[PDB]
Design a protein around this nucleic acid. Structure first.
Ligand SMILES: Nc1ncnc2c1ncn2[C@H]1C[C@H](O)[C@@H](COP(=O)(O)OP(=O)(O)OP(=O)(O)O)O1
Ligand SMILES: [Ca+2]
Ligand SMILES: [Ca+2]
Ligand SMILES: [Cl-]
Ligand SMILES: [Mg+2]
Ligand SMILES: [Mg+2]
Ligand SMILES: [Mn+2]
Length: 747
DNA sequence: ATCAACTGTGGCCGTGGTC
DNA sequence: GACCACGGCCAC
């Protein structure tokens, strides 16, 4: 399989490098014959002799058009000849493209901002991560000597650990007597020993956990202090530290640096994303956390270096086993998008959608539209109407079925051929008309994006079908992440229609999809109440909860399956209503907030404070206890005993102050806030101390006894000290616990 | 490193403002 | 005390 592509320049000329792994052998293929290009549409064919002569400049070297070639293509499905303008070097394209657009005989240019390495993969029809090839993988982690108030990486690395299928080992330059610790003389020898281990094991994948931001930058600083050529790349290069939006990412040429953190962060929802928490979340086994401050007094005193060597070895071991499980996911997503796993695992969703569309456009001989310029961008900032959300019939309900549409919006795009190249296209025999908003969509030929969503949905449903044939629970959970990731990707094609930066943008298409969605779900609700006598308890966009009031579980289930047959035979094309579960009891508080219990006593809760990252644990823990006493047992006297038992204790100061921490993210530069709530008030004070707040910083604070604004008496939970701070028992009772549990206990 | 960043809307609710 | 906008996080 192909791992990655890039290019280098030799004596002015690009050379594509393709990093392959075939038959257990690593190979670099070199391509010097593939040419960079973009396209120009001309007012007339005669003007090509002029456009051919346009020149630019690029660090003193004159940029010319190398050769041109006339090609027939489609733009939004409509045929058109354009001129493919070829250049000697990729960097010619940004140097000359504006001078070509500016030429009065040039109506427009296209595909002029496509990175050459990825251009190569698309035009060659090459897909990374294809084939039976078993990649060799190696995880690594580092233990560092930390002192608070020092510069980054001022202290040494104390241990480097790596793990793979042969096991886990720790390299260190302190005298640790353990069987997996290899002892060397200096920090420099330790790094050099790791470098040699990577060269000897020669892994295809290097796995870290946040190595994009920590491990590699630390290594780089130490190698700079120590005079070490950190030649981890298969071509002898050092790790290449690239900028990616607000943060960094690191590549190792010839291998795949799979940083697990961005992948895990986007597919599992957790309170904290410590390596320990993730490992517990995925496998169910506990992993211990030795702290950067237990580490530092252990190294200076000699004691408990073996416990640190064990925490370092565990870090590498779990990092490996995690990468073992998640690589198939990202290798499949990499195969579907047609780009490298390094890129696909790190990039925004819109960008994946678009790289997928550029490849399909190439395969179909469709010219790509350009990104919007700043004028068009400002024009695309109108919003539109979305899904329908019924106000729930509040309270407790028995024998509830949950019926839900299979991939609704993508199904609508497929069924009604909803796409920019079919919108109000004249001349067709057949049209579907969007309700409320009126846009017409031609049905005579598949639309570009409609013809792509079907293979995605098919892929997802096969994964779900295979989820049904496997007994292994961990393997079933990983299959669950994969099909959910495809669900999100397919739905992002719909959102992409409304995305101001999209090339194939189409706000008519996006509001047509939602309008069809409101039509289908509300027709389904009317159908199930009028023909079958159900009562729709609650509904959100494409599914609903319903019961036959007074009927037992068997009757509600049988009559629910009857309705599905009826409705699914009325529904056209790819629309399909699905049976998504039966619940013995349910409690619906407001829109988006409810909890149900299945016929096994497993509670599923949605939107309620229990699941929110920004409510205090004491509040979440109490509402969880109230809910469980409420839906499992029919014990209203138990729930009320729990809240009163928590009121006292908080008032008596008997509840641990760790359960009162509020976590809220900073999302912008602190100057740009217009409303200063408690998490901003704490963060602005940190900024005044030189703590360097940035978007993404989580404020973890606690509220102390007082009466002013809440931000006035909030401090970082760091600075909490029981000898000196009594917390605000009245705040945590009247503003955190009681509000949460009372909205439930109103019924 | 060469663009990439940031798929869409609906909705609750605590906070700290105005009036 | 009535009301409303901001901001964060969640459900689709
Ligand atoms: N993350 C999202 N981005 C954009 N639109 C979304 C997203 N999540 C949901 N929607 C929209 C499009 C969905 O088809 C519709 C209904 O949501 P939902 O029931 O969760 O998903 P679904 O119908 O695509 O999948 P499933 O087959 O699992 O029910 O709401
Ligand atoms: Ca060469
Ligand atoms: Ca049907
Ligand atoms: Cl760009
Ligand atoms: Mg569903
Ligand atoms: Mg749904
Ligand atoms: Mn659905």
């Amino acid at each position: 399989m192909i791992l990655d592509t890039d290019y280098i320049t030799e004596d002015g000329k690009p050379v594509i490098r393709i990093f392959k792994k075939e038959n257990g052998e690593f190979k670099i293929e070199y391509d010097r014959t593939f040419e960079p290009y973009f396209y120009a549409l001309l007012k007339d064919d005669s003007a090509i002799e002029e456009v051919k002569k346009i020149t630019a400049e690029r660090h003193g070297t004159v940029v010319t058009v190398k050769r041109v070639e006339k090609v027939q293509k489609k733009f939004l499905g409509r045929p058109v000849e354009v001129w493919k303008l070829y250049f000697t070097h990729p960097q010619d394209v940004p140097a000359i493209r504006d001078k070509i657009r500016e030429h009065p005989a040039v109506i427009d240019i296209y595909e002029y901002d496509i990175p050459f390495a990825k251009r190569y993969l698309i035009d060659k029809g090459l897909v990374p991560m294809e084939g039976d090839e078993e990649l060799k993988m190696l995880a690594f982690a580092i233990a560092t000597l930390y002192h608070e108030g020092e510069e980054f990486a001022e202290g040494p690395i104390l241990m480097i650990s790596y793990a793979d299928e042969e096991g886990a080992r720790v390299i260190t330059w302190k005298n640790v007597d353990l069987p997996y610790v290899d002892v060397v003389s200096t920090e420099r020898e330790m790094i050099k020993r790791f470098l040699r281990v990577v060269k000897e094991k020669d892994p295809d994948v290097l796995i870290t956990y946040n190595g994009d931001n920590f491990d590699f930058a630390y290594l780089k600083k130490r190698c700079e202090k120590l005079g070490i050529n950190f030649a981890l790349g298969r071509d002898g290069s050092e790790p290449k530290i690239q900028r990616m939006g607000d943060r960094f990412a690191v590549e190792v040429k010839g291998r795949i640096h799979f940083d697990l953190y961005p992948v895990i962060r986007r597919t599992i929802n957790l309170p904290t994303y410590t390596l320990e928490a993730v490992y517990e979340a995925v496998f169910g086994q506990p992993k211990e956390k030795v702290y950067a401050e237990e580490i530092t007094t252990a190294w200076e005193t000699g004691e408990n270096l073996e416990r640190v060597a064990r925490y370092s070895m565990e870090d590498a071991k779990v990092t490996y086993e995690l990468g073992k499980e998640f690589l198939p996911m990202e290798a499949q997503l990499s195969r579907l998008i047609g780009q490298s796993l390094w890129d696909v695992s790190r990039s925004s969703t819109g960008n994946l959608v678009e790289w997928f569309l550029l490849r399909k456009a190439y395969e179909r001989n469709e010219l790509a539209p350009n990104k919007p310029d700043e004028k068009e961008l400002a024009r695309r900032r109108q919003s539109y109407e979305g899904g329908y959300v019924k106000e729930p019939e509040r309270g407790l309900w028995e024998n509830i079925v949950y019926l839900d549409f299979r991939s609704l919006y993508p199904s609508i795009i497929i069924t009604h051929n909803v796409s920019p190249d079919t919108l109000n296209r004249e001349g067709c025999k057949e049209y579907d008309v969007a309700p409320q908003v009126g846009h017409r969509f031609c049905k005579d030929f598949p639309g570009f994006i409609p013809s792509l969503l079907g293979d995605l949905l098919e892929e997802r449903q096969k994964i779900k079908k295979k989820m049904k044939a496997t007994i292994d629970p961990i393997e079933r959970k990983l299959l669950d992440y994969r099909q959910r990731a495809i669900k999100i990707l397919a739905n992002s094609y719909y959102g992409y229609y409304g995305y101001a930066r999209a090339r194939w943008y189409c706000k008519e298409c996006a509001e047509s999809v939602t309008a069809w969605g409101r039509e289908y779900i509300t027709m389904t609700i009317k159908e199930i109440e009028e023909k079958y006598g159900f009562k729709v308890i609650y509904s959100d966009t494409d599914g609903f909860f319903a019961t036959i009031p007074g009927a037992d579980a068997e009757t509600v289930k049988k009559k629910a399956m009857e309705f599905l047959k009826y409705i699914n035979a009325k529904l056209p094309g790819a629309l399909e209503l699905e049976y998504e579960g039966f619940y013995k009891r349910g409690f619906f508080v407001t829109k988006k907030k409810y909890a149900v219990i299945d016929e096994e006593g497993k509670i599923t809760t949605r939107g309620l404070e229990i699941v929110r990252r920004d409510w205090s644990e004491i509040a979440k823990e109490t509402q969880a206890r109230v809910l469980e006493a409420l839906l499992k047992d029919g014990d209203v006297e138990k729930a009320v005993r729990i809240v009163k038992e928590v009121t006292e204790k908080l008032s008596k100061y008997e509840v641990p102050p760790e359960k009162l921490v509020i976590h809220e993210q900073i999302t912008r530069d602190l100057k740009d806030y217009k409303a200063t709530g408690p998490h901003v008030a704490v963060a602005k004070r940190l900024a005044a101390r030189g703590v360097k707040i940035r978007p993404g910083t989580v404020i973890s604070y606690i509220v102390l006894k007082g009466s002013g604004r809440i931000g006035d008496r909030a401090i970082p939970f760091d600075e909490f000290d029981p000898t000196k701070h009594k917390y605000d028992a009245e705040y945590y009772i009247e503003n955190q616990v009681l509000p949460a549990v009372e909205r439930i206990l109103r019924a």
